[PDB]
Amino acid sequence: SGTRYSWKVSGMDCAACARKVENAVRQLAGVNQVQVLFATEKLVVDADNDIRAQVESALQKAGYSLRDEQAAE
Numbered sequence: 001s002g003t004r005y006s007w008k009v010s011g012m013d014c015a016a017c018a019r020k021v022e023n024a025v026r027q028l029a030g031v032n033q034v035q036v037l038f039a040t041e042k043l044v045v046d047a048d049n050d051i052r053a054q055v056e057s058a059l060q061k062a063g064y065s066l067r068d069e070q071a072a073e
């Protein structure tokens with residue numbers, strides 16, 4: 001897999017929220033695969049560029065509060 005990034009998102013609770021989130025991040029560029037696991041308070045992005053600082057901003061704009069959980073485990 002390219003890279004796996006994740007964030008801890010205290011706000012996503014709905015599949016509609018999830019879809020808007022995965023769209024809100026997917027629209028960027030760098031992001032290849034989106035895996036936004038609402039309710040479990042996390043988003044994962046596979047991005048073969050550099051867009052996390054874009055994602056985080058994107059979610060923050062959309063109206064969430066994520067924060068960087070490192071570049072995988």
Ligand SMILES: [Zn+2]
Nearest residue numbers: 012013014017
């Ligand atoms: Zn919601």
